[PDB]
Structures are given as structure tokens and as C-alpha cells.
Antibody, heavy 227, light 214 residues
Framework: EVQLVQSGGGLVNPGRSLKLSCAAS????????MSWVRQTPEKRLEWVAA????????HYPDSVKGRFTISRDNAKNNLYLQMSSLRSEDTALYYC??????????????????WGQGTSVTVSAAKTTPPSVYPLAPGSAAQTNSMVTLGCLVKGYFPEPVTVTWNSGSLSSGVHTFPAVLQSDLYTLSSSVTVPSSPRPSETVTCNVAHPASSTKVDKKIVPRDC | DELLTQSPATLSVTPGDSVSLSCRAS??????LHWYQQKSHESPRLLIK???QSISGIPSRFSGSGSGTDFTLSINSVETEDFGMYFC?????????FGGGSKLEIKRADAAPTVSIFPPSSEQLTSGGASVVCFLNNFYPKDINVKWKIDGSERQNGVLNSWTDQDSKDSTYSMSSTLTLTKDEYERHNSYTCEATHKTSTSPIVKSFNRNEC
């Protein structure tokens, strides 16, 4: 128990606003101080706001002071972060975290002993564009083995993320999903799968892509064919 | 504003070796130092409370030591479950600050990539574009050099690479290399080559295809 779950993250233009939520469970919420922490793409951890078991005594780093507001609802057991005046640099994963039992033992410290899963917030002017799904089949010419490799290119989409499964989640082993790379405001991602060269054209290999942002969903058969 | 300076930044270890991660502080901050562990695709975890005092359910293998400007996290035998990023955080004074991070990697034997090359889809081709893709699979160490050659001459223009993080199964890395051409420039050259130069060999591993079809 002691579960924290963030929601509300998404694509925002620079200058717009977003409101994040964090649901607590497994504890008596009003007895604990919580904080918001953001992880940046270059993998750094930065603290952005603290809030007490009862409300009062909100703390901010100089950077956030004036744009973000940390709120709680001790009733509905929800922590909030209201972001405003957003700018590109606020792009990152936001995590809600809780601090150890808060007592008036004459001022003490604050560790973060439980953390959320994060919500992603992207500040960008780029527009939502769904992906193009292309099948990568190998040339039935003269491979080297008992195993054949197959792929799918997910191209030209915005923003992240996309979900890519093989055979609807069935084909689990021999999958490599490569991290998306952003170029000219659109991301491109690839996924590869290695299956035995017997179940080849015989058994159908399909890659399932979903890009929630565009509410897009493509099912693309590959069957290791003669090109 | 405290500065926490973490050393080393990167570090490869043989499962078995003890390691020491340092977290220096620009100021005092006595025991107000805490250490977190973040595995791949997971959230940070509390490990060491006040640079000595662990939490629980954590191995005894992890030791937190220090007071003042220098604090250290000791990991006595390195195990596969143990590789990820390690962060120190100071609670002493607001604004709470963290240190850059100490990435740990599993040093394994060297391994040659299995490369496969893929011509543009005929689906892609309608839309006027051609992406030629090479996968460089399960190699170690990470540093690999990939070059595109069109009819023999090196092509720099239009390439986008993507490396995976270290695998949890066997400690390898993977990589996708994409070259993007227009159908027009694609229908004007004959041979597509992708050459990978890795530690593992003196000769570049090369995989090619000739355009042609049906």
C-alpha cells in the first residue's frame, strides 16, 4: 500500500497551462507532507514545490516561484500542481513524492520515501500529427539462419509516446523497441522482432501501433516475404 | 542553493566488484543527505536515509557513510539487480537539491552486432519517400560506428541513429540507423550499404542490398 498515481500530463504550448493530480492511497494523507519532483530528459532530478500535511507553508525553488501552485485536497486525498506561464524548459516527467511523518520536534529534515510513476509534460508549439506505419520485411535472398528479423518504422508523429506491440502482445521475446528521436518536429521510432525462419510467411507477424494523442491505431502485417 | 557533486558520473562494473560513489557538498549539511536508486524504466527508490541509515528490504550490501561535505554509498558486491542510476539528495535546506547522478553499467564480454538491412517499403514509396534501415543487434561495448554508402560513397546527410539502453537479459546494447531519401534520389542509385565498425573486429561488418525487384 502507499500508492501515489499522477495524471494530467500532456502537450501544452509555451505560455499555456496544465493542472496535474496525484492520487494517494495506503495512508492517512493529512499527516504527510508531499512534494513534486521533475525528471528532465537528460535524466536530472529537480525539486519544484513542497506542501504540508495541513496546507500552509508552501515551498518553491526560485525558478517555479510565480508560475506553479501546489495545492492538496486532504478529503479526496489528492495532491495538485497547477502550472502556468509554461516554457520549453518545463518539459519533463513529473513525480509526486511524500515526506516522512511531520512533527514539531523543533524543525527537522525531509526525505522522499515513496514516489509516483510520473506524468509527462511537453511544452511545444509543434502540433499533434499521428504516425505513418511502414513494414520492414527482409529480402528472401540469402540470410544466414534459422532466425529472420522483422521490423516496423513509426514515422512522423507528435508528441510522444506511441505503443508498439507484436502479434497483439503474444510475440514477447526477441523484441527491440528503439527510443524515439526527434527531428524536424516529428519523432521516428523503430521496433524489430526475431522469429524462427519456419514460421516465416507461414505465420503472420503484425505490429500494432497506437498513438493515443491522435487517437490513432494501425495494424500492419509484414509476413517475412519476397520483398 | 547547495551543489551536490557526484563521482563518478559513468562507471562500468564487473558483477562481483565493490564500488564507491561520492557525493560532495559545497556546504556542511551533516546527516541531511539521502541516496536514491532508479532502475531503467522505474521511479527512484529510497535507499539510504541520512547517509548511514538504510530503509528496509534492501540488501546489507549497500552502505551509506559520511557527514559534512563528503558522503559515500558503498555497494559491496555488484549484482545485475543493482545497475541503474544512483542519486544523492540533501534535505538540510530548501531548496532541496539533488546531485547529477551516478549511472552504473554491467561490464560483460565484448559482442559482435548481427546487422540486417531493410530497403524502403512500397507503401512508403507512394508518399514519395524512402527510408533504408539497418538494425545493429546485441553488441557490447556500446561504441560502434555506422556509416551509410550509396553506390560506394559515404552518406552523412539524412541519418538518424538510436541506441537502446543496456539490456537486462544479457547486458548488450542495440541500435537502429535510419537513412531517409526521397523516392526520386532512391530510384537513381543501385546499392545501399551500412558499415559497422566495432572493437570486436578489424574489418567493418557490412550488409548490403541492390535495388531491383519484380
Amino acid at each position: 500500500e502507499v500508492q501515489l498515481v499522477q495524471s494530467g500530463g500532456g502537450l501544452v504550448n509555451p505560455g499555456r497551462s496544465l493542472k496535474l493530480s496525484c492520487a494517494a492511497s495506503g495512508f492517512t494523507f493529512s499527516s504527510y507532507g508531499m512534494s513534486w519532483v521533475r525528471q528532465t530528459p537528460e535524466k536530472r532530478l529537480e525539486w519544484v514545490a513542497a506542501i504540508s500535511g495541513g496546507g500552509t507553508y508552501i515551498h518553491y525553488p526560485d525558478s517555479v516561484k510565480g508560475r506553479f501552485t501546489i495545492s492538496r485536497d486532504n478529503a479526496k486525498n489528492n495532491l495538485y500542481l497547477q502550472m502556468s506561464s509554461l516554457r520549453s524548459e518545463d518539459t519533463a516527467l513529473y513525480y509526486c513524492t511524500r515526506h516522512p511523518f511531520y512533527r514539531y520536534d523543533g524543525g527537522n529534515y525531509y526525505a522522499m520515501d515513496h514516489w509516483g510513476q510520473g506524468t509527462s509534460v511537453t511544452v511545444s508549439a509543434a502540433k499533434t500529427t499521428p504516425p505513418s506505419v511502414y513494414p520492414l520485411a527482409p529480402g528472401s535472398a540469402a540470410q544466414t539462419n534459422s532466425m529472420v528479423t522483422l521490423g516496423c518504422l513509426v514515422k512522423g508523429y507528435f508528441p510522444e509516446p506511441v505503443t508498439v506491440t507484436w502479434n497483439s502482445g503474444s510475440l514477447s521475446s526477441g523484441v527491440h523497441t528503439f527510443p524515439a528521436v526527434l527531428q524536424s518536429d516529428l519523432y521516428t521510432l523503430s521496433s524489430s522482432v526475431t522469429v524462427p525462419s519456419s514460421p516465416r510467411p507461414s505465420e503472420t507477424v503484425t505490429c500494432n501501433v497506437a498513438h493515443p494523442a491522435s487517437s490513432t491505431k494501425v495494424d500492419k502485417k509484414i509476413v517475412p516475404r519476397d520483398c | 542553493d547547495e551543489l551536490l557533486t557526484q563521482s563518478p558520473a559513468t562507471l562500468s562494473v564487473t558483477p562481483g566488484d565493490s564500488v564507491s560513489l561520492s557525493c560532495r557538498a559545497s556546504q556542511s549539511i551533516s546527516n541531511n543527505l539521502h541516496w536514491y536508486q532508479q532502475k531503467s524504466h522505474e521511479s527512484p527508490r529510497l535507499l539510504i536515509k541520512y547517509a548511514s541509515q538504510s530503509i528496509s528490504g534492501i540488501p546489507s550490501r549497500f552502505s551509506g557513510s559520511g557527514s559534512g561535505t563528503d558522503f559515500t554509498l558503498s555497494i559491496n558486491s555488484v549484482e545485475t539487480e543493482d545497475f541503474g542510476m544512483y542519486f544523492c539528495q540533501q534535505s538540510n535546506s530548501w531548496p532541496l537539491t539533488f546531485g547529477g547522478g551516478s549511472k552504473l553499467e554491467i561490464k560483460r564480454a565484448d559482442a559482435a552486432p548481427t546487422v540486417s538491412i531493410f530497403p524502403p517499403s512500397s507503401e512508403q514509396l507512394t508518399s514519395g519517400g524512402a527510408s533504408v534501415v539497418c538494425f545493429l543487434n546485441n553488441f557490447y561495448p556500446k561504441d560502434i560506428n555506422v556509416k551509410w554508402k550509396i553506390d560506394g560513397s559515404e552518406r552523412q546527410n539524412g541519418v538518424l541513429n538510436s541506441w537502446t539502453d543496456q539490456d537486462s537479459k544479457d547486458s548488450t546494447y542495440s541500435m537502429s540507423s535510419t537513412l531517409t531519401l526521397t523516392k526520386d534520389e532512391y530510384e537513381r542509385h543501385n546499392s545501399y550499404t551500412c558499415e559497422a565498425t566495432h572493437k570486436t573486429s578489424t574489418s567493418p561488418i557490412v550488409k548490403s542490398f541492390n535495388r531491383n525487384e519484380c
